[PDB]
């Protein structure tokens, strides 16, 4: 229906759609890697990611979350591979030293965000079971941080929801899901 390279909503799969298993999320094309946490191409951008609570308490704020890059914890993370893919979605020239803030955040490339039940103890926005598609998010900004406990650079990303469809935890989103049957 859509290629692997597809940006944005998967047609016929609305916000609030849920799947018991990651393989099913993958089958539906919503987040194609059934193990990898992020789907992207380093020379293009990120298409989807799975959020399971974030790096710390109170990091998932629903409409906004702070995502953490991959790599390392024995080495400085780098703006390569999926880290680079995600940063390319941000509406700003790529900067691998200080990071960048988007000029206009809504103009960024869209990321499909799936919340996993695995973050239910940490995030009030996580589904209580399975996986749920929460819609489109944009990378507002990204920045490097040296961690206090291991002393290596880790990439950090601010994501903010930008979707016409109401978020599943809202009154609108709740009612929409009930109607979809």
The domains located in the chain, with CATH, are 1-181 (2.30.280.10)
Place of tokens 């109170």: 58
**58/42 Cα distance (integer angstroms):** 29
Q: How many helical (H) and strand (E) elements, i.e. helices and strands, does the chain have?
A: 3, 8
Q: Are 138 and 106 in contact (CB under 8 A)?
A: yes
User: Which residues are 51's β-sheet partners?
Assistant: 115
DSSP summary character for residue 130? S
CA angle 49, 73, 90 (to 5 degrees): 35
Q: Are 55 and 66 in contact (CB under 8 A)?
A: yes
* Structure method: X-ray
CA angle 141, 144, 147 (to 5 degrees): 135
Resolution in A: 2.3
Enumerate residues 6+ apart whose C-beta is below 8 A from 175. none
CA dihedral 64, 61, 144, 142 (to 10 degrees): 0
**119/129 Cα distance (integer angstroms):** 10
């Amino acid at each position: 229906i859509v290629p692997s390279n597809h940006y944005g909503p998967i047609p016929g799969i609305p916000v609030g759609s849920t799947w018991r298993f990651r393989v099913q999320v993958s089958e539906a094309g919503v987040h194609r890697p059934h193990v990898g946490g992020i789907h992207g191409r380093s020379n293009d951008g990120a298409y989807s990611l799975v959020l399971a609570g974030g790096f710390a308490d109170e990091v998932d704020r629903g409409d906004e979350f702070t995502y953490t890059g991959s790599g390392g914890p024995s080495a400085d993370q780098t703006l390569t591979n999926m880290n680079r893919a995600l940063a390319l979605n941000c509406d700003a020239p790529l900067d691998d030293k200080i990071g960048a803030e988007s000029r206009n955040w809504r103009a960024g490339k869209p990321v499909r965000v799936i919340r996993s039940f695995k973050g239910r103890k940490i995030s009030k926005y996580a589904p209580e079971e399975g996986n749920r598609y929460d819609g489109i998010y944009k990378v507002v900004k990204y920045w490097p941080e040296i961690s206090s406990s291991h002393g290596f650079l880790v990439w950090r990303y601010l994501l903010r929801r930008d979707d016409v469809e109401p978020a599943p935890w809202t009154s609108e989103g709740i009612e929409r899901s009930r109607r979809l049957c």
